[PDB]
């Protein structure tokens, strides 16, 4: 999976989600032996989109500057974020819950197709590329959103290694920043080609 999914779907509406996650994973860029999702391109694919199935309802974005901080705090801010930006996430516990398990059980979960490592051999740094999806349904029964997300998380960390076992208070000169768009999705809807 390019994009780990995370739905709260009733049955009929999973296939419909798997297609969205079929829809945004063509816009994942493999260059340089990286993958990184191509945010320019997905929006230029969503706005010259024209069906009834798919409707954008918006895109929110937050770079922060490195900040010497627990994992806690940040993932925390990052979950909040999420929240008050997004009616498709309403809950901020379960949401906290799954970045946070991510960032403290990344040396296992290093071979999934939803995370990208890379090191700057300039600025004696490293980073990781976090890309979830949320499905949520409506209440019209027949309609539910996805938050395509990509969540971008630098530190002073010059080894891949610097990031095996971290814990909630782990204390580092944390850089991020996250990439969110709500998309509001009908029953039936079809990633084309």
């Known amino acids: ?3 780990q999914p995370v739905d709260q779907l009733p049955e009929d509406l999973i296939p419909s989600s798997i297609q ?23 929006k230029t694919a969503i706005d010259n989109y024209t069906g009834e199935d798919l409707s954008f309802d918006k895109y929110d974005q937050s770079t922060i500057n490195q900040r010497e901080q627990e994992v806690g705090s940040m993932v925390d801010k990052i979950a909040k974020f999420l929240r008050d930006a997004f009616s498709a996430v ?5 949401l906290g819950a799954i970045i946070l398990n991510t960032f403290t059980n990344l040396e ?14 300039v600025k004696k740094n490293s980073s990781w590329e976090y890309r979830v999806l949320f499905s949520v349904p409506f209440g019209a029964p027949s309609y539910f959103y996805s938050l395509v997300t990509t969540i971008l998380i630098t530190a002073d960390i010059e080894e891949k290694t610097g990031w095996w076992g971290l814990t909630s208070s782990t204390k580092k000169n944390f850089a991020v920043q996250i990439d969110a768009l709500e ?9 084309p080609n």
């Open 90 to 94: 309403v809950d901020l516990s379960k």
């Open 1 to 3: 999976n390019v994009f």
């Open 20 to 42: 969205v996650l079929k829809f945004s994973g063509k816009y994942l860029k493999l260059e340089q032996n990286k993958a990184y999702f191509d945010w320019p391109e997905f």
């Open 183 to 191: 998309l509001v999705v009908k029953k039936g809807f079809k990633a």
């Open 108 to 121: 296992e979960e290093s071979s999934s197709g939803f995370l990208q490592f890379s090191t700057n051999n």
